[PDB]
Amino acid sequence: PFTLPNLPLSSLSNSRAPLPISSMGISPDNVQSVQFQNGRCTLDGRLVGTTPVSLSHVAKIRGTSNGTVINLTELDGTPFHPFEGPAPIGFPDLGGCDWHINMTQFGHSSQTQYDVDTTPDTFVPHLGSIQANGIGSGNYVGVLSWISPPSHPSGSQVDLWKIPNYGSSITEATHLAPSVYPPGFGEVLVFFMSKMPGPGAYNLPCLLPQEYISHLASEQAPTVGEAALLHYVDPDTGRNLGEFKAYPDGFLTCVPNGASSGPQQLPINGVFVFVSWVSRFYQLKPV
Amino acid sequence: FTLPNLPLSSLSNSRAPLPISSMGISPDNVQSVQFQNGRCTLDGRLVGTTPVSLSHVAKIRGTSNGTVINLTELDGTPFHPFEGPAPIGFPDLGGCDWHINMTQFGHSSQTQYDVDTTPDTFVPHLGSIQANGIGSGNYVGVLSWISPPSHPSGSQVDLWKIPNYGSSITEATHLAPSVYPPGFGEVLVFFMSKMPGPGAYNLPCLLPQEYISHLASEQAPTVGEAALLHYVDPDTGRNLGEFKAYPDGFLTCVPNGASSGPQQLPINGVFVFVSWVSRFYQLKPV
Ligand SMILES: CC(=O)N[C@H]1[C@H](O[C@H]2[C@@H](O)[C@@H](CO)O[C@@H](O[C@H]3[C@H](O)[C@@H](O)[C@H](O)O[C@@H]3CO)[C@@H]2O)O[C@H](CO)[C@@H](O)[C@@H]1O[C@@H]1O[C@H](CO)[C@H](O)[C@H](O)[C@H]1O[C@@H]1O[C@@H](C)[C@@H](O)[C@@H](O)[C@@H]1O
Ligand SMILES: [Mg+2]
Ligand SMILES: [Mg+2]
């Protein structure tokens, strides 16, 4: 039968940054669809977007600075070409913020904070090039460390529901993984949340924990139905804490009991368990 | 029984968040190892300071008072000596100085924390390590790069070691037990990664992190004396070598002489469980 990891959510990682999962949640009123490029894996094991199998590749960059630009490669140094995607595998996908990436080197001492505004014309990872912003010549590996409000537009909020502008303009085609929409029926998308360091109470959402991605990529389920009915289970008591659906494209939903009672009010130490394949129209009991 | 159907080169070290770049054997001045991270038995028992998730690997959390950092678990839960040699996920890289990147919830900026693990102030088993200039506050830290140990002065990096978690080398810290080569011409197999810093630093571990989460999820009900495995090229399906996985959570093979061992294998293959065999099942070299 089809399986999800038999691991409690609070033991798992975000798939958009190497951070422990601290809660589940729903999106703000002003967010309907999302278009995350990391943390995208179908139920039959197809990785989508810039998603890697391993957290060791998540929210990382690799490239060589000439003092003006950083020419990007894949994490292992392999060339990256525009046809391959919006950015190299694992490249950070946090829109709506400035990044602070910790840069280190193979064969040299020290780390350097690389400050990334993802809005200027020089930020073109789809074409393999981003501004150096004072990073001296050399080859670096970088990992996202902390975030802050965007440099532009001035006074913008931190909005992690967004993805960055990977192309030379927002109108350049960059081979983005497609958007994910709430499927209707009163079902809402479920997000796995992590606290992100920086000068505010930042919470990073993703569609699946990273360990779900490696699990599904390994499992390569030969049978995927229209929707998987799941129970969110307390491992000790075995109590079913609520019904959820997982959809083939790689996301979970539930029907909240009301505005103040939904997946965010459930304990975070539960385990999602596959129950059965159901119709896409299967109506869930509110959680 | 299953292992991940994933190529090794797609996976992570379990002692630091680094891609796997090769398999290797131990140096000839190392017979046994005692890593505290990357320890999981075949039936899914986490051992030492090993976490389920790479998001906890080689990380620290604690509050500096400017003199010491008082440690907690990564989620802020108290850590007590009876629980182990250090909080879950705490770095286990001996034979080097650490440079840890410290960040804070609710504050800007990062700070490099330089850790000599040799002085008597380095007592993570008792929940305390020297601040070494880290100002007052609560931090989460992740290992960023390493350098040669400050003591003994002039020594080389040696990642086959673990640090001194106790108040002295004689203090009992509830270390996970050592892993020994099991006999029958078999060698311990290590999954290797390259660690940033001023040298060519090679970090070994006993299992990729994704194997840890897989085994911890799977909770195999029927573990035998040893699992016979094949290392397989996925496309071609070719068996590249017979290996054994042992219940305590390590792999072995028999090298084909001094010239040909795990290091000579390509790193894009997949370990596949074949059958349970006896502990003394004799492997074919390679
Ligand atoms: C660039 C920077 O650090 N900006 C942050 C700003 O920093 C000011 C303080 O350091 C202040 C201390 O007295 O000095 C200001 O500089 C003055 C000099 O003092 C003065 O002698 C000289 O004549 O004039 C200059 C002004 O031209 C610094 O600008 O502090 C802010 C409040 O803490 C902080 O929010 C700001 O951080 C940047 O904020 C924008 C949004 O506005 C973006 O999020 C940026 O990403 C963010 O920068 C990032 O964080 C800072 C703390 C630092 O780590 C940067 O490297 C990083 O990119
Ligand atoms: Mg689960
Ligand atoms: Mg494998």
Swiss-Prot record, chain A:
Residues 1-49 are annotated as: P1 sub-domain 1. Residues 1-287 are annotated as: Protruding domain. Coiled coil: none annotated. Residues 177-287 are annotated as: P1 sub-domain 2. Residues 50-176 are annotated as: P2 sub-domain. The soluble capsid protein may play a role in viral immunoevasion. This is Soluble capsid protein. The chain holds residues 230 to 516 of 530 of the full protein.
